[PDB]
Structure formats: C-alpha cells, structure tokens
Design a protein around this motif. Structure first.
Motif, PDB file in Angstrom:
ATOM      1  N   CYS B  76       0.843  -1.193   0.000  1.00  0.00           N
ATOM      2  CA  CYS B  76       0.000   0.000   0.000  1.00  0.00           C
ATOM      3  C   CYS B  76       0.883   1.250   0.000  1.00  0.00           C
ATOM      4  O   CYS B  76       2.086   1.173   0.253  1.00  0.00           O
ATOM      5  CB  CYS B  76      -0.887   0.013   1.246  1.00  0.00           C
ATOM      6  SG  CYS B  76       0.060   0.289   2.769  1.00  0.00           S
ATOM      7  N   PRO B  77       0.291   2.422  -0.279  1.00  0.00           N
ATOM      8  CA  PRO B  77       1.012   3.698  -0.316  1.00  0.00           C
ATOM      9  C   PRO B  77       1.812   4.020   0.945  1.00  0.00           C
ATOM     10  O   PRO B  77       2.918   4.548   0.868  1.00  0.00           O
ATOM     11  CB  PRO B  77      -0.103   4.711  -0.560  1.00  0.00           C
ATOM     12  CG  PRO B  77      -1.051   3.939  -1.431  1.00  0.00           C
ATOM     13  CD  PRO B  77      -1.106   2.604  -0.717  1.00  0.00           C
ATOM     14  N   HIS B  78       1.249   3.707   2.104  1.00  0.00           N
ATOM     15  CA  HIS B  78       1.930   3.986   3.360  1.00  0.00           C
ATOM     16  C   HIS B  78       3.190   3.144   3.577  1.00  0.00           C
ATOM     17  O   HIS B  78       4.283   3.686   3.735  1.00  0.00           O
ATOM     18  CB  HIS B  78       0.976   3.780   4.538  1.00  0.00           C
ATOM     19  CG  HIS B  78       1.662   3.759   5.867  1.00  0.00           C
ATOM     20  ND1 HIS B  78       2.325   4.852   6.381  1.00  0.00           N
ATOM     21  CD2 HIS B  78       1.817   2.765   6.773  1.00  0.00           C
ATOM     22  CE1 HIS B  78       2.859   4.534   7.546  1.00  0.00           C
ATOM     23  NE2 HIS B  78       2.565   3.272   7.808  1.00  0.00           N
ATOM     24  N   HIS B  79       3.057   1.823   3.574  1.00  0.00           N
ATOM     25  CA  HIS B  79       4.228   1.002   3.821  1.00  0.00           C
ATOM     26  C   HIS B  79       5.326   1.117   2.777  1.00  0.00           C
ATOM     27  O   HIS B  79       6.499   1.006   3.112  1.00  0.00           O
ATOM     28  CB  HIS B  79       3.821  -0.455   4.046  1.00  0.00           C
ATOM     29  CG  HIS B  79       3.160  -0.684   5.371  1.00  0.00           C
ATOM     30  ND1 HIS B  79       1.850  -1.094   5.491  1.00  0.00           N
ATOM     31  CD2 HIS B  79       3.609  -0.491   6.635  1.00  0.00           C
ATOM     32  CE1 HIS B  79       1.519  -1.141   6.769  1.00  0.00           C
ATOM     33  NE2 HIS B  79       2.568  -0.779   7.484  1.00  0.00           N
ATOM     34  N   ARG B  81       6.427   3.645   1.496  1.00  0.00           N
ATOM     35  CA  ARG B  81       7.232   4.786   1.909  1.00  0.00           C
ATOM     36  C   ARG B  81       7.817   4.720   3.317  1.00  0.00           C
ATOM     37  O   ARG B  81       8.409   5.693   3.791  1.00  0.00           O
ATOM     38  CB  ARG B  81       6.412   6.065   1.741  1.00  0.00           C
ATOM     39  CG  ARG B  81       6.011   6.299   0.303  1.00  0.00           C
ATOM     40  CD  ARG B  81       5.101   7.500   0.128  1.00  0.00           C
ATOM     41  NE  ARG B  81       4.934   7.812  -1.289  1.00  0.00           N
ATOM     42  CZ  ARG B  81       4.325   7.019  -2.165  1.00  0.00           C
ATOM     43  NH1 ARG B  81       3.812   5.862  -1.775  1.00  0.00           N
ATOM     44  NH2 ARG B  81       4.241   7.380  -3.438  1.00  0.00           N
ATOM     45  N   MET B 143      -5.163  -0.499   3.457  1.00  0.00           N
ATOM     46  CA  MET B 143      -5.937   0.380   2.587  1.00  0.00           C
ATOM     47  C   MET B 143      -5.070   0.814   1.401  1.00  0.00           C
ATOM     48  O   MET B 143      -3.917   1.185   1.579  1.00  0.00           O
ATOM     49  CB  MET B 143      -6.366   1.594   3.412  1.00  0.00           C
ATOM     50  CG  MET B 143      -7.192   2.642   2.714  1.00  0.00           C
ATOM     51  SD  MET B 143      -7.537   3.975   3.913  1.00  0.00           S
ATOM     52  CE  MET B 143      -5.945   4.794   3.984  1.00  0.00           C
ATOM     53  N   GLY B 144      -5.627   0.758   0.195  1.00  0.00           N
ATOM     54  CA  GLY B 144      -4.876   1.150  -0.989  1.00  0.00           C
ATOM     55  C   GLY B 144      -3.905   0.079  -1.466  1.00  0.00           C
ATOM     56  O   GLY B 144      -3.168   0.276  -2.432  1.00  0.00           O
TER      57      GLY B 144
END
Ligand SMILES: [Zn+2]
Ligand SMILES: [Zn+2]
Ligand SMILES: [Zn+2]
Ligand SMILES: [Zn+2]
Lengths: 194, 194, 194, 194
Positions: B76-79, B81, B143-144
């Motif tokens: 996902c976008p968070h992990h 980064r 999420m994502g």
DNA sequence: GAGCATGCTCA
DNA sequence: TTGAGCATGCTC
DNA sequence: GAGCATGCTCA
DNA sequence: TTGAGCATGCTC
C-alpha cells in the motif's frame, strides 16, 4: 488553539441542532464539544458574532492534533488519500480540510510551521439569520494509517481582519469516522464517568 | 496450477506447537498461512529427486479472486514509503526473502508482477526438506493495497533456464492476530464440515 | 445465434456449479439457460470440447437482443456508462462484453453489421481439467436507460479456426442486474408455469 | 433565500382537483412540486405592486443538499442526446419554458449554472397572478444526472438591469407517478406531525 | 440482504 | 389516459 | 444500521 | 511477548 476568545465581536461557533437527516453523516456532541463526521461529507459550521466585523474580514480553518505529544506534527492526509483522485480542482491533495460551496477559497501552507489552513471571506448572516454557515469537509478518517492514525484533532476557526490580525477564535474536537452516530454515543457513554 | 512435476515438488509447513506459531501459523484444512507483518515465515520445499543443477525457487503473490486476479499485488502507499527496507528488496514488493545475501527481485516486463527468486538448495544432511524464510510487508487489510482482498503465494521450482519444474501454492492472510483469525476462518469453514 | 451446434469438436458451454461465494455476483439458471450477474463482475464461463481444436483456434463472444423485434439493433453500453471512467485500457468504451484475465483480447466491430465482439485465443484445459475457463464482464445493467433498456440479451460464444470459420457455437441468455439471486428466483418461479 | 422584496413577490400553485394534477401536483406541507418528465407545470407569480418596467423572471435548479449544492444541475447523458429539443432550449438544460417564443437560456460564466429567463408580464385583467409554464426534462432519478438527488427550483424577479427584486423557491421531484410519490412523501412527513 | 425507492407494463 | 402491481436499483 | 471484520491498547 | 477487549471500517 485550545484557548478560545470571543474578542471585540463576540465571535464563537455554533453547530447544527440534532434531529436532521444530516445527522447520519455529521453530528455534534455538546458535552464533548466534538464533531463526529464521515469522510468527504459536508459539515455545516455556524459563525456567530455580536457585531459586524471590519470590512475585508476573513475566516480561517486549521487542524492541530489535540495531544500535546503530537501538537507539533502537521495534520495532513495519509499517503493513500493524498493520491486518490478526489480533488475538487481547488484544494491541494495533502490538505485535510476543504471548504465546500466557495469558488475562491485560499488554501495555505505556513512558510514557517508548514501547517495547512483554508481561508474564505467573512460574510454576514442572510437576512433574518443570527449566524453565517460555512460547510467544511474532512478528507481522511481520524484512523487513517500514516495520517492522523487514530490521533484526535481540533479544528481551529479564527476570525481575522483584512491584514491577518486575530479578531476572534473558537475550536472543537473532530473525529472523522465511518459511523458518527455509533462513535459519538460510545465516547459520550464513556464520558459519563465523573 | 499445482503439479509436483518430475521431482515430486510440493510445499510443507512447520507443525503446530511452537513459539513461532504466534507470528506464523499454517492451516491445513484451508491450505492457508496466517502471519504477522514483517515476520519471518518458514516454508518447506520437498522433492523426491534432486533438481537439475542451477535450479531456482520463485515466490509470487496474486489475488485469489478472478475479480482481482489481473491486479498486481503490491504494498500500500503507506508502507511503500516506510523506511523498513533491507537494502535489497524494492520498496513496492510485498514478499521479501530473509536470510539470503543474494535474492533476485523481479518485475515481469509484461504482467508487471513482482517476484523474488533464490537458488534452490538441497536439504541439510539429515533433513527431508529445504526451508526458505519469507516475509510479507503489508497486512491483507492495508488500505490502498491488498485492501482486505485475500492473496495466494505461488512457489515454483524452475531450472536454470526458467522452465517450470514444479509448482505449489497457498493462501495467505497477513494480520495482527494470526491465531485468532485462523480459528475464526476455521470455525466458519467447519460450519459445513460436520 | 439462437441455434447451437457442437460441431466436429463437440463444443458447448458449461457454468459454475452453485454453492460458491461467487454466486452472489454471478449465478447461472439451468432451466432458463440464463446467467444472472452484476455489472462489472467477472463471470467464469466454461468451454467444453471432446477433441482438440485446430492450432490457432479462437473463441468469440457477442451479445444480441433475444426478441426478434430488437434483434437488428446493436447491443452497446448506454450513454452514461460509455462515458464513465471504467475502461481497462484495452476495451473500447461502447463495448458491453469485456474479457478479464487476458493481456491481448481483440475487441472488434463488424464492418457490415457493426456488432461488437471480443476474441481471445482458444486454450486447452489445465492438466486434469475437462474444460477451459474464460472470465467475462458485462458493463451495463440490462435495465440501463438508452442501452439494453430492460431488453434481455443472448451471449453467443463461437469457436472458430485461425481463418474465422465456425467450428462450434453455444449461447445463453443474460440479465445484468443489482441482485442476481433475487432476480433469478423471480424468473424461475414465474417460469414454473407449464 | 426567500424574500418578497418591495413588490410582495412570492409563488403560487394551482389548487388540487384538476385533470392536470395527474401530471403536476403541488404539496403545501412540503413546499414541493411533483411532476412528470416533459409535462408543463403552471407556476403562479404574485406581486402586491407593479414591478419596474423591463422586469424579468428567472428559473434555476440547484441541488437541495449542501453535499451536492455546488454541482451544476443538468440533464443526464441519455436525455441530453434525445431529439426532444424545441429549437430554443439547449440540450443540456433541465428547465424549459413553454409557450414563450423568446426565452433566454443562460449559463453563468462563473458558476456555469443553467437558467432560463422570460419577461415579467402583468396578470391578465381579472387575475391576481401571472402564470409561467415550465417543463423539467429529466426525472429526479435519471442515472448520471440528478441521480435521485432532490432539487430546488429558484424563481427570482429581477429588474431590467439584473438586480433581484424578489425570490421564492420550491423543491421538485420529477417522476413517473407524481400522485403516488406525493402521498408517500407526505405520509412519511406526517409520521411526526400528529 | 431487506425494505424502500420507482419507472414500466397491463387492462 | 390512469392507477395497481410488477420490475429493480439504492440505502444501511 | 447490524454484525462481522481487525488493528491497537492494556496489564 | 501475548491474548482479551476495545476500537472501527466494510458487507449487504
Ligand atoms: Zn486517509
Ligand atoms: Zn501496507
Ligand atoms: Zn449502462
Ligand atoms: Zn434524464
């Protein structure tokens, strides 16, 4: 921020009374001075003044984390929603708070603190009204991973003159969630201990 | 998609009753591994005959449902980064191999799917299988990313030229509480077995 | 179209057996030879042959209105969905039927009848299987205003050799709707009159 | 937004008990007009004093909920492309005036909202109000258009220069069965009145 | 999924 | 031309 | 909206 | 380090 003063214009906020279909997406809690709302849903916030603010007055909205341990961290949308394609063509992608119903909002980022804020011109109530309504939208849930990440926030609404001087200030906590009604009752019942 | 080939290739998982079970627990009835984010998962490679020299083992993740099978499984976008890299694995890759100084992280030029390849090594003298440790870098709920969509890990044994020698697979659920979640899915499953 | 012949390869279609979670989004009705499915959901259709088709064989899918009064009208997506941004980057916007899981489908429009069709290469069953599966998606509800507009359709699946000659043909009615299970029971109960 | 101004401007609707009621029926308790698609709706203009020479009457539609208030109300993709034009009204306009050879169909250069303007005419000798016939060219349910979102029609009386003299409004629901739907909404409404 | 929400068919 | 009942997507 | 689905807090 | 219970978005 946490301190609220009405100033020389008796500025303070008001919220929608209960018992409306809007309540499902946006519901205010008086004992907790907290707004429970869903993501991307319009929240009508009321602006109350006892005297007409100077010409050119402005109303700014900003979000700050409530806990003193997170107060220094800038509130922003999580990594995922910052990249979703929900932009209204006016609001920057990283901004949590958006104003709905205005063709010319000013989306700002403080050159020093880097905090996001949105400013719209102050407008007097419609004839026969004691308050002005501004519809805000929060673009992330309070739970969003990598964003607010379950940390509660405070929305600071400040009345300022044409030059940027503070004329008044009020605030309220906010929880952006999936089920506002459910979550509001939860915190209220939990609050019923004192 | 599951064939042992000419070398009797198939996978195995550690039996229950080990401290490791808390972070990684396999479910026989569901052919599904339940594990925590970033925790090492020991997968066993079994063969009835020695694979040709230069053989390799590939791991790849695909969404189980045909509704999402064409979507490339990624973090996902968070992990993506987060600064949890090991200096070897690309930031977007969900599956990482642990304990190997020379894994190959690939992205297929056509399907764009991620995969990690390591050399096939024979069991240690006295053992009937070879163990490879894998780590999944996002929860199935992210999420994502996988966004609550179940995935399948496909392990294929290939010769030096890339030809498939054997292939096996298992469903995976990366979550906060593997034990609890495994029981929940097994109890539901058993709600038809009696 | 309405006529179905197995040809020299004993070609005919098969559908997913009941009792699967897929049933909620896609469910076949034997007595009505009709597939009830939701919009944009993958439907697994089975291809059965008694002998291997010639090399280079292809499988085409086309939709035609069932009623002889609408048979001449080309089945296309309604005005609204044709403009939605749901394209997969391969399927044209006006096409009702899309194939999922294939990197190289051929989306065609007949130069004379102007009918839309999608073609994918014929592939033999996986080892140990008696049928091949192709996942199709219907991009409009049968009720869509300005599109199928409540008019039922038939999906024609034809097996053809490398040159375009027909090798076999089968068909089934389809209703794209919001609640496949509910609507299937309705028509079946209504059918129970003869 | 509702003020009679210096000319006592406000709207009126035909009383019940007319054959017209089937296609157009007003609801006093809900200040809501229920009408069929493309059917003429007589709206009455009432004033206590003669408006200045050259005055005009404007009709505009806006979504009632703040959640959708900024979205321009227009016809759905299907009806926009139907050949039901009158040679005067643009294809995208929801509100059309009937019986006038010279209406002005406008699109605001900033908000992009549609509106139709006609000259203000005094009541016919013997009448206390002026009637203007409007037609709504999409149902409130039209997919890709109003899409089940309720709208408000705003009628404003303006002088020759465009300054507002008065303004009134009413909710509208364009549907297949006005009578049935009016009762349904009234009964629900009454489910709190007793 | 149920129940409500709504255009279309039928006499 | 008009409902009554059937047909069907959407709310929660 | 309920109930199920799931990461996080607390001892 | 580990559940148990609390916290919370998603299914239908
Ligand atoms: Zn977010
Ligand atoms: Zn993740
Ligand atoms: Zn459509
Ligand atoms: Zn329309």
């Amino acid at each position: 921020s946490q301190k609220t003063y009405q100033g020389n214009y008796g500025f303070h906020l008001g919220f929608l009374q209960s018992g409306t279909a809007k309540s499902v997406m946006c519901t205010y809690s008086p004992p907790l001075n907290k707004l429970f709302c869903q993501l991307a849903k319009t929240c009508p916030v009321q602006l109350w003044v006892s005297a007409t603010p100077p010409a050119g007055s402005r109303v700014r909205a900003m979000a700050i984390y409530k806990k003193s341990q997170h107060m220094t961290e800038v509130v922003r949308r999580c990594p995922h929603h910052e990249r979703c394609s929900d932009g209204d063509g006016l609001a920057p992608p990283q901004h949590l708070i958006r104003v709905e119903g205005n063709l010319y909002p000013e989306y700002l980022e403080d050159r020093q603190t880097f905090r996001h804020s949105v400013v719209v011109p102050y407008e007097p109530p419609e004839a026969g009204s004691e308050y002005t309504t501004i519809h805000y939208k929060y673009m992330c849930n309070s739970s969003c991973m990598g964003g607010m990440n379950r940390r509660p926030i405070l929305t600071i609404i400040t009345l300022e003159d044409s030059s940027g001087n503070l004329l008044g200030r009020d605030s309220f906590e906010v929880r952006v969630c999936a089920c506002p009604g459910r979550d509001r009752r939860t915190e209220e019942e939990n609050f019923r201990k004192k």
